[PDB]
Amino acid sequence: GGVKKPHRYRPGTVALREIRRYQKSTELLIRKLPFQRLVREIAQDFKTDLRFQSSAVMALQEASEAYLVALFEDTNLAAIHAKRVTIMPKDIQLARRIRGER
Amino acid sequence: EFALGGRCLAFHGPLMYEAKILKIWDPSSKMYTSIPKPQKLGEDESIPEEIINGKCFFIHYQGWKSSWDEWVGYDRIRAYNEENIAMKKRLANEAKEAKKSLLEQQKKKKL
Amino acid sequence: KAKTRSSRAGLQFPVGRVHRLLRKGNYAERVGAGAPVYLAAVLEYLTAEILELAGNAARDNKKTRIIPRHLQLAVRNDEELNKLLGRVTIAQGGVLPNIQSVLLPK
Amino acid sequence: TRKESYAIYVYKVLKQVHPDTGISSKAMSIMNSFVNDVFERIAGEASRLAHYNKRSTITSREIQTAVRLLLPGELAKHAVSEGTKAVTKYTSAK
Amino acid sequence: LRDNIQGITKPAIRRLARRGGVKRISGLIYEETRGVLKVFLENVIRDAVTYTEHAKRKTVTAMDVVYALKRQGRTLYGFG
Amino acid sequence: DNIQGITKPAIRRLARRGGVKRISGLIYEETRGVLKVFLENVIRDAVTYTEHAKRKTVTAMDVVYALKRQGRTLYGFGG
């Protein structure tokens, strides 16, 4: 007769819940070691064997997450601009086509 | 047969579900063995009395959380063999027919 | 007995230091006496409004000591300090909590 | 080895404002870099103003034209007011 | 090393975008973003290895990073 | 009202130079306010600079000087 059904939050509730979770966190998101490596291969191209402090990396990250959370933010406004809740690659592009990096 | 941590197929309402055997209960010794070692029931641990006289297994449903973990006797537990898998397929087909009858009655309700 | 220039000016930030710096900064050839006094006066103010606002933020989160986050709130909540510190990215700030109205459930 | 920074000064003005509140060291460094940056911007604009007006000295006047050109909106008025009363007390106490 | 851009995992690119207040991240964004991280991190790090060499230092310093970010406009407080 | 002197066809001409093919009608009056607030930023700084030279007249040099401060340099008028 009555068959079970698991308790699944509707698409979007878990979303907004972790939005409120993450907009109160100040902790960095991109993980450290993965990021650190991002550089050693993004630097090896500019100068060989450039050592890096454990603070340059942390800085070059804080500066990155900060740059990205800003761009995502203008991406969203750009996504809402077309009356849509999905962001698209064009958005990150319109946004950046207006900051003048493109 | 039944082993600690092994596959099993179990009743749950009218249908068959796969489960892990985490504990094996012996009614005579009032005791169960567990996986990370004999031990008795804890303060918050209890078994329903309908099955506690038979050999029980604490089982965990695959694809479902630990809130669904429960003690089952030989009535509700079977070994993971091809006969049980085949009748599991058969009862899955019965649930499929029930869902199809649901679709038929709702589409007649729409008309 | 030698007194400091800050107590002459009634300030807490150092007026002496801000003179040296002004001099070695070579911002200009000659620097007058009152220029480091005024700059220390403005810097302490800006350091104060920002510290006050941070104090208003912290008590709210019931935390004794100010931590870098409290300093972002203070800056992004205020609409002036935000034009000033507007292309600045503070460490461990997070962002002002905000979600758009169309993203809310109906 | 000696590192010059505005540690005890900002701490003082913090107790002058709140004589009950602690401060984080990283947050301190936020304050130190922030006062250094705004000092650089106010002093640079001043240097410029001067070099435009063919002057050669950074008078308290320039720092003002500057504070009113950089600090935005009201933050300025209250900056000026406090800077003018500060230099007034400096000249009154000589 | 090589192709470590994939280290900025999707789970994370999301967490950042989630931080930024987005609710639905289309796929085809996870690739675009990593590209944006690698144009930003490029310029900054480049302007930092130039600062590094000028000082004839080898250890890319956090001090240089901050100065580099300034040049591009994205000043960072918390390090010097 | 001197603001309404920035006429529609003029805002249309700015849009045409800007590559716009259909201008809403409500744009015209949005472009005024945006225009004003911007001029009201340059000219403000233009004058701070002016009253620093104790000059009472403003110069084009002070105008491009205020633009340099804002960020948008203007070549062709001095400096």
Of F77, F73, F4, nearest to F42 by C-alpha is F73
Cβ contact (<8 Å) for F49 and D65?
yes
> How many residue pairs from chains D and E have C-beta atoms closer than 8 A?
14
Number of structural domains chain C divides into? 1
Residue B36 touches chain A, beta carbons under 8 Å: no
Task: Note whether B72 and B61 are within 8 A (CB).
Answer: no
Instruction: Answer whether C39's CB lies under 8 Å from D42's CB.
Output: yes
At F27, list the tokens.
């744009």
Alpha-carbon dihedral angle through residues A92, A95, A98, A100, given to the nearest 10 degrees: -50
Rounded-to-integer distance, Cα A95 and Cα A2, Å? 51
Phi (first) and psi of residue B14, to 5 degrees: -90, 0
For residues C98 and C73, is the Cβ–Cβ distance under 8 A? no
Taking contacts as CB-CB distances below 8 angstroms, the residues of chain D near F65 are 52
Interface of D with C in 42-71 (CB under 8 A): 42-44, 46-47, 50-51, 55-60, 62-64, 67, 70-71
Do D37 and E80 count as a contact with CB atoms less than 8 A apart?
no
Rounded-to-integer distance, Cα E35 and Cα A43, Å: 16
Token couple for B45: 């641990």
Strands (E), chain C: 30-31, 88-90
Q: Which of C51, C54, C48 is nearest to C12 (CA)?
A: C48
CATH number of the domain within which C102 lies: 1.10.20.10
Residue range of the domain that includes C78: 1-106
Count CA atoms closer than 13 A to C95's CA, side-chain side: 25
Nearest alpha-carbon partner for E53 in A43, A55, A50: A50
CA-closest candidate to residue F31, choices F17, F11, F13? F11
The answer to whether C84 contacts D46, with C-beta atoms less than 8 Å apart, is no
Closest chain B residue by Cα to residue A5: B64
Helix (H) or strand (E) holding E50: helix E30-54
Within 13 Å of residue E74, how many CA atoms lie on the same side as its CB? 23
Residues in chain B, overall count? 111
Buried b vs exposed e over C17-26: b needs ≥16 C-beta within 10 Å?
bbbebbeebe
Domain at E1-79, CATH from 3.30.70.141, 3.40.190.10, 1.10.20.10, 3.40.50.800:
1.10.20.10
Q: Where are the beta strands (DSSP E) in B29-95?
A: 31-34, 38-39, 57-61, 70-72, 77-79
Q: Which domain holds residue A28?
A: 3-102
Give the contacts of C49 (CB within 8 A, at least 6 positions apart). C81, D75, D78
Unique residue bearing structure tokens 């029931």: B41
Closest of B20, B22, B28, B80 to residue B55, by C-alpha:
B28
Q: Answer yes or no: are the C-beta atoms of D27 and C50 closer than 8 Å.
A: no
For residues F5, F6, F9 and F11, what is the CA-based torsion angle, rounded to 10 degrees?
A: -170
Write out the two tokens for B102.
């649901």
Backbone angles phi, psi at F20, to 5 degrees: -95, 135
Could you give the CA distance from residue D88 to residue E45 in angstroms, rounded to a whole number? Answer: 47
Q: Give the whole-angstrom CA distance, residue C82 versus residue C49.
A: 12
Kind of pairing, strands A86-87 and E24-25? parallel
Resolution of the determined structure in angstroms stands at 3.1
Is the dihedral angle over the CA atoms F49, F55, F58, F64 positive or is it negative? negative
**Cα torsion for D86, D88, D89, D91, to the nearest 10°?**
120
Q: Would you call D49 exposed, middle or buried from its count of C-beta atoms within 10 A (0-12, 13-18, 19+)?
A: buried
Contacts of E73 (CB under 8 A, 6+ apart): C87
CB interface of E with C, residues 43-62, below 8 Å: none
CB proximity under 8 Å: A 44-73 to E? 46-47, 49-53, 55-56, 58-60, 62-73
Enumerate residues 20 to 79 of chain D having a beta carbon within 8 A of any beta carbon in chain F: 45, 49, 52-53, 61-62, 65, 68-69
C-alpha span between B89 and A26 (Å, rounded): 50
Cα B1 to its chain centre, rounded Å, is: 15
- The number of angstroms, rounded, from the C-alpha of B111 to the middle of its chain's C-alpha atoms is 40
Q: Which domains does chain D have, with CATH numbers?
A: 1-93 (1.10.20.10)
Beta strand B15-26 pairing with B57-61: antiparallel
CB F70 within 8 A of CB F40: no
Strand, coil or helix: B77: strand
In 3D space, the residue among C89, C84, C8 whose CA is nearest the CA of residue C47 turns out to be C84
* CA distances, A33 to each of A46, A54, B26, B85, E31 (Å): 20, 11, 50, 46, 20
Distance (Å) from the alpha carbon of D52 to chain F's nearest alpha carbon: 9
CA distance C63 to B102: 57
C78 exposure class (CB count in 10 Å sphere: 0-12, 13-18, 19+): middle
Every domain of chain F and the residues it spans:
1-77
Check: CB of residue C89 under 8 Å from CB of residue C75.
no
Rg value, chain C, Cα: 19
Is E73–C103 a contact, with Cβ atoms under 8 angstroms apart?
no
* Among B residues 49-108, those touching chain A with beta carbons less than 8 Å apart: 64, 95
Residue-wise burial string across C38-67, b where 16 or more C-beta atoms lie within 10 A, e elsewhere: bbbbbbbbbbbbbbebbbebbeeeeeeebb
Q: A62 and C92: CB-CB below 8 Å?
A: yes
Q: How far, in Å, CA of B63 to CA of B93, rounded?
A: 19
Phi-psi category of E56—alpha, beta or left, where left has phi over 0 and alpha has psi -120 to 50? left
User: Residue E76 and residue A63: Cβ atoms within 8 Å?
Assistant: yes
CA neighbor of F48 nearest in space, from D88, C84, C34, D70: D70
Nearest CA in chain E to A55: E62
CB B87 within 8 A of CB B71: no
Residue tagged 């991109």 (tokens):
A30
Q: Give CATH superfamily name and number for F1-77.
A: Histone, subunit A (1.10.20.10)
